[PDB]
Every structure is written in structure tokens, then in C-alpha cells.
Design an enzyme around this catalytic site. Structure first.
Site, short mmCIF file in Angstrom:
data_model
loop_
_atom_site.label_atom_id
_atom_site.label_comp_id
_atom_site.label_asym_id
_atom_site.label_seq_id
_atom_site.Cartn_x
_atom_site.Cartn_y
_atom_site.Cartn_z
CB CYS A 38 4.31 11.50 6.92
CB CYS A 96 -6.44 22.07 -11.73
SG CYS A 96 -5.98 21.17 -10.24
S1 LIG Z 1 2.77 13.33 10.81
C1 LIG Z 1 3.80 12.14 9.99
C2 LIG Z 1 3.35 10.69 10.22
C3 LIG Z 1 3.78 10.11 11.59
O1 LIG Z 1 4.54 10.82 12.27
N1 LIG Z 1 3.42 8.87 12.13
C4 LIG Z 1 2.54 7.84 11.53
C5 LIG Z 1 2.36 6.62 12.40
C6 LIG Z 1 1.64 5.45 12.23
N2 LIG Z 1 1.80 4.60 13.35
N3 LIG Z 1 2.60 5.23 14.20
N4 LIG Z 1 2.96 6.46 13.66
S2 LIG Z 1 4.15 12.63 8.26
#
Ligand SMILES: *S[C@H](CC(=O)NCc1c[nH]nn1)S*
Ligand SMILES: [Zn+2]
Ligand SMILES: [Zn+2]
Ligand SMILES: [Zn+2]
Ligand SMILES: [Zn+2]
Ligand SMILES: [Zn+2]
Ligand SMILES: [Zn+2]
EC number: 2.3.2.33
Lengths: 150, 250, 71
Positions: B134, B186
Site C-alpha cells: 500500500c 539503475c
Molecule cells: S492507500 C493504502 C491501501 C488501502 O488503504 N486500501 C486497499 C483496499 C482494497 N480493498 N479495500 N481497500 S496503502
């Protein structure tokens, strides 16, 4: 080109403050139409209730083919927003469509406060607290709301 | 109304327009921009090819020039991803077999969500870059340089012993600095994972013996414990190492 | 009768009586555009609607608009 993005940003603005999304304001902050400020109110049912939360919004030159850069400038305790005010929101990344508008982003962010997603969290600490101890999560959220957002 | 639901700048009555196989109607010139821009950032995703509205794949005779190289990339990735999921033994996974979860009966869907693929600049095929984090997914946009994405086969710095089954097609390298599959390559010498690349100024400066040893996390962390994240013996953190074929140990 | 806007503009129509539970409005949503209630949230006037409350629990009247956001 940018004149195209601008015609689209003006449309969104005109559409917006003449029918705002529930519990949010947004608009240019100078004469630079690519840089906006926004507020989202803590939803009524959430520990964020009564908080006013400030966001920053940068539109790219080729809007709306690329999404806007959106962040919190108000500190907030939440599994999917980090200490830099970065938001883990699909529709701002892989799931962006040019059919989306700022209204829809703000509505989407507001829902995210109403109901966090702990499964793929951006802050895995807060994520943990949420899943294991809800009472605690609310207390800290409200506490933070009181320090930073009122 | 007569408004084009891609650029809300218009009525369709205004310039060249087309109706997609899906049924709804857009400026031709708008559909083309959507398809030229493709995805955001380095990691291949295919959000952009669905219909702004009904989110069924965009289709049309006039658009086949753009769609055609895409379908082929989508094919390539779906193929590689689904394979990796099976080999990794995650096709029976509970997030596929549970009715009413996101990818019920969608092994391909789950896998392309879970894995991160990049277009190699030298050849032009997708390669695997690791589980999608994420943290990378709320990081930079396209403040990146596509020349530094290079599949294992095109960056063979370890003149590596090929896999008899799959030639070099699924060859992958370690990050020079931690226990992760590499993403970037790189200065035509150095493989970096996503996080270490973000922080390459630092990473390069750290003296070789001061790096974390296995098990090693990105950006200089020392992971606790005794088993390597890559489940391989490898040379000490700081040296290049070809990990082999990605499917065949996973 | 009430409407449901998807984030991306796609509007859908439903016949409903006030007492309708949002449970079965998520269900009645599947019958038309076929998504699992378990993935879909309904937002009205900035409130995320709770499963198993009525619609006039929320003061939702003839010809109102909800939004479907989904994870
Ligand atoms: S921005 C972060 C990822 C997240 O908050 N949610 C992913 C997701 C997939 N299905 N529901 N939420 S690192
Ligand atoms: Zn258009
Ligand atoms: Zn469509
Ligand atoms: Zn290559
Ligand atoms: Zn092999
Ligand atoms: Zn690394
Ligand atoms: Zn290791």
C-alpha cells in the site's frame, strides 16, 4: 491543453459551490486555478464529529486524464491517512476515471472517515488498534479531533 | 444531456464522437487520450481501460490500434500473474473461494491485484516486482524514469544459470540492499526494490558492512529472526544476486 | 421510487416504500446491476446508511438520491 483542464476545473467549481457535497467545501485559494483548498467535516456518526479538516488539492496540467494530488493538512488519527496527510484511496490512484469529480473525491474521502479500511492499511499501528480495541480507537480519534481539528 | 461523460467540457454534438460496444457514447478524441495515457505511475494496472461509466472494457473498431497492444499486455500479465498465484499455491485461497468477497471465483483478478508487474524497457514484456504494497500505492506518481525498469533477463549482471523448464523468462534479482525482489535497475549496475529506490541516496552511502544482514528489510531495517524473506541462501546484503526463476521456487 | 448515483455518474432507479430496510435496498440493488451487498456502501446527505434501518429512519423521501461507493 491546460486551457482544456482549466475549462474542466471551472466547470467543476461552478457545479460545486452551487450544490456542495454534504459536509465539504472546496475551491481555489488564489488566482491559480490548479491549487485548491478543501474542508471535510467529521461525519456525524464518527469519532471525528465536530472536527473541521483541511485538505490540499493539486490538479495536473492534463486534468482530468490524471487524478488530482489530495492530502490532509489537518493532523488526523486514521488507519488510511499518514502523518503527512497522504490518503490511501483507490480512486486517486489505480481506480481513477475522468468521469470522477472533486465532489466525488470529497464524498469518497468523507465516507472513508465514516468507515475506515483496516485490511490494507497505510498506518498498520492504528489499523491494529481499530481491529482489536474499538473503544480505544474512538477515544484517540476524538482526542486528536479535539487537539487538531477544533 | 448531450454532455460527454469523460471531459465534462462538452456536448458530444461538438466534435468527432463514437459509441463503444458497451453502449454509451463519448468523443472519439477523448477515448483516445484515455487509452494513450494508460496507467498512472510505473506499476502496470488496467483500471483505465474500463468504461468511465459501466466499467466494462472499452471497445471499438476505431480504437483497435490502441486496444490491440493493450489486450496483448493484459494477456501477458494475466498469464504471468495467474501462473504465479497457482505456483504460489494461492488459487484455493479463501479470498477466491468465499462467495460475496471481491474476487469470488476470480483467480486472475485476485492475482493481478496482489502482484506488481512492470513493463521492461529493453524487451517489452511485463516482469514481476513483488507483492504490491500500500505504501508504494500512496507514494509518488510518475516522478519516475521508465528506462530504469528492466526485467531479470535484460539485467543479467550475474551471468546466471538458466532454468531448464522456463528459459530465463521468469528470472528475478534480489534488491542489492535488502531481502526483496528487485524492481528497478539503475546506473546499469544496481538493482533496487521499491522503497530502497525511493531512498537511493542514503542506501548507496551506507558502508557495506553496516547494511542489515539477512533477514534484511528495505531502507536499512534489520528484520527480527532467522529465516530469509526470499527463502534462499544469498550473498551478504550489498552484493548483487540472481534469485533464479520466480515460479519454480514459489 | 428513488435513485442511486454511482461515483462515476451511472444512475439507477428503484421502486420502494418508506419502511424498506437498507439491507434489502442493497439487495434490490443487486437485482438490477448485480453487486454483492457486502461490497457496497450507501451514502445519503453525508451519512453512511446502516444495514437494517428503514429509509424514513433517515428521512429519505420520494425521488431522493443516494450514492453507491464500494471497497
Ligand atoms: S492507500 C493504502 C491501501 C488501502 O488503504 N486500501 C486497499 C483496499 C482494497 N480493498 N479495500 N481497500 S496503502
Ligand atoms: Zn469528451
Ligand atoms: Zn459503458
Ligand atoms: Zn526485458
Ligand atoms: Zn522455471
Ligand atoms: Zn531494498
Ligand atoms: Zn535474506
Amino acid at each position: 491543453g491546460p486551457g482544456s483542464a482549466l475549462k474542466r476545473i471551472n466547470k467543476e467549481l461552478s457545479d460545486l459551490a452551487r450544490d456542495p457535497p454534504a459536509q465539504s467545501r472546496a475551491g481555489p485559494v488564489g488566482d491559480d486555478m490548479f491549487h485548491w483548498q478543501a474542508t471535510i467535516m467529521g461525519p456525524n456518526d464518527s469519532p471525528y464529529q465536530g472536527g473541521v479538516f483541511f485538505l490540499t488539492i493539486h490538479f495536473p496540467t492534463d486534468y482530468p486524464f490524471k487524478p488530482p494530488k489530495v492530502a490532509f493538512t489537518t493532523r488526523i488519527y486514521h488507519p488510511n491517512i499518514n502523518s503527512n496527510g497522504s490518503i490511501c484511496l483507490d480512486i486517486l490512484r489505480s481506480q481513477w476515471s475522468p468521469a470522477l469529480t472533486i465532489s466525488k473525491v470529497l464524498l469518497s474521502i468523507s465516507s472513508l472517515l465514516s468507515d475506515p479500511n483496516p485490511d490494507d492499511p497505510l498506518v498498520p499501528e492504528i489499523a491494529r488498534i481499530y481491529k482489536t480495541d474499538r473503544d480505544k480507537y474512538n477515544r484517540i480519534s476524538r482526542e486528536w479531533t479535539q487537539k487538531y481539528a477544533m | 444531456d448531450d454532455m460527454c461523460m469523460i471531459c465534462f467540457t462538452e456536448a458530444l454534438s461538438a466534435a468527432p464522437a463514437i459509441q463503444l460496444d458497451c453502449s454509451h457514447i463519448f468523443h472519439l478524441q477523448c477515448c483516445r487520450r484515455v487509452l494513450e495515457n494508460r496507467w498512472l505511475g510505473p506499476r502496470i494496472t488496467f483500471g483505465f481501460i474500463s468504461c468511465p461509466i459501466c466499467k466494462n472494457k472499452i471497445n471499438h473498431i476505431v480504437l483497435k490500434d490502441l486496444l490491440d497492444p493493450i489486450k496483448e499486455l493484459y494477456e501477458d500479465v494475466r498469464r504471468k500473474a495467474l501462473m504465479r498465484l497457482e505456483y504460489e499455491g494461492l488459487h484455493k485461497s479463501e479470498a477466491i473461494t468465499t462467495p460475496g468477497v471481491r474476487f469470488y471465483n476470480d483467480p486472475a483478478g485476485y492475482a493481478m491485484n496482489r502482484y506488481a508487474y512492470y513493463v521492461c524497457y529493453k524487451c517489452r514484456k511485463a516482469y514481476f516486482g513483488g507483492e504490491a504494497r500500500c505504501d508504494a500505492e500512496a507514494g509518488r506518481g510518475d516522478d519516475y524514469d521508465p528506462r530504469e525498469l528492466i526485467c531479470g533477463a535484460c539485467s543479467d549482471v550475474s551471468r546466471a544459470q538458466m532454468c531448464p523448464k522456463h528459459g530465463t523468462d521468469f528470472l528475478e534479482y534480489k534488491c542489492r540492499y535488502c531481502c526483496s525482489v528487485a524492481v528497478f535497475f539503475c546506473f546499469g549496475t544496481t538493482h533496487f526494490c521499491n522503497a530502497c529506490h525511493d531512498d537511493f541516496q542514503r542506501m548507496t552511502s551506507i558502508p557495506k558492512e553496516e547494511l542489515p544482514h539477512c533477514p534484511a528489510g528495505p531502507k536499512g531495517k534489520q528484520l527480527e529472526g532467522t529465516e530469509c524473506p526470499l527463502h534462499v541462501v544469498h550473498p551478504p546484503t550489498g552484493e548483487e544476486f540472481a534469485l533464479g526463476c520466480g515460479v519454480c521456487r514459489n | 421510487q428513488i435513485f442511486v448515483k454511482t461515483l462515476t455518474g451511472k444512475t439507477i432507479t428503484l421502486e420502494v416504500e418508506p419502511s424498506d430496510t437498507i439491507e434489502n435496498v442493497k439487495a434490490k440493488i443487486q437485482d438490477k446491476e448485480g453487486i454483492p451487498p457486502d461490497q457496497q456502501r450507501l451514502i445519503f446527505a453525508g451519512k453512511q446508511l446502516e444495514d437494517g434501518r428503514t429509509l424514513s429512519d433517515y428521512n429519505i423521501q420520494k425521488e431522493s438520491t443516494l450514492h453507491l461507493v464500494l471497497r
